[PDB]
Amino acid sequence: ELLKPRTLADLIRILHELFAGDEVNVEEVQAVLEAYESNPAEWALYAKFDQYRYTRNLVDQGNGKFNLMILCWGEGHGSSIHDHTDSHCFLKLLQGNLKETLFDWPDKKSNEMIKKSERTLRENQCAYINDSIGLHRVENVSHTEPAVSLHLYSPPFDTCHAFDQRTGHKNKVTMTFHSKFGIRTP
Numbered sequence: 001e002l003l004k005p006r007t008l009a010d011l012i013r014i015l016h017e018l019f020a021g022d023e024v025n026v027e028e029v030q031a032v033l034e035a036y037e038s039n040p041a042e043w044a045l046y047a048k049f050d051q052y053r054y055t056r057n058l059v060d061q062g063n064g065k066f067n068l069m070i071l072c073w074g075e076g077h078g079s080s081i082h083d084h085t086d087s088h089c090f091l092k093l094l095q096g097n098l099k100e101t102l103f104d105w106p107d108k109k110s111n112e113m114i115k116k117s118e119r120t121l122r123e124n125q126c127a128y129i130n131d132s133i134g135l136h137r138v139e140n141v142s143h144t145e146p147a148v149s150l151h152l153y154s155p156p157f158d159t160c161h162a163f164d165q166r167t168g169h170k171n172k173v174t175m176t177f178h179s180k181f182g183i184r185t186p
């Protein structure tokens with residue numbers, strides 16, 4: 001019985017219920033993430049920005065079933081084109097807007113990766129991606145507004161691939177956490 005999360009802490013408790021088992025009801029997880037109304041005071045602790053690139057701030061480790069993290073995107077900050085390491089990946093906007101560009105998996109032949117579509121993710125929306133859907137890039141294209149997003153990955157993963165848009169070639173990257181549980185982790 002999915003109820004509206006009243007707070008971030010309530011959302012986290014609900015997520016622990018939704019991930020108690022071995023499978024993932026994607027539509028229910030997405031619905032509960034979308035139903036949480038972002039309250040900046042509840043997540044200010046995790047919203048630690050860096051001047052030069054986006055930061056990943058771990059919020060909850062989901063008792064091993066998922067990583068819940070907050071990403072903080074300065075103006076003009078964006079990601080690589082990347083995969084999600086055979087995990088579910090939910091992305092909910094907490095503040096601002098992000099541009100999501102979707103790409104197909106490259107072929108063996110070296111070729112330019114041409115976007116398949118793009119969309120603007122707005123405040124409180126929750127999007128979803130997995131490797132079966134494709135690859136994506138996420139970018140804060142704003143010149144004036146930092147963006148903050150809440151990401152849930154299940155199972156948790158510490159590495160993924162970045163893809164060269166000019167060729168489709170991929171390189172393994174290790175995810176680093178800027179902070180964990182509100183504590184800066186150099």
Ligand SMILES: [Fe+3]
Nearest residue numbers: 082089136138
């Ligand atoms: Fe992603």
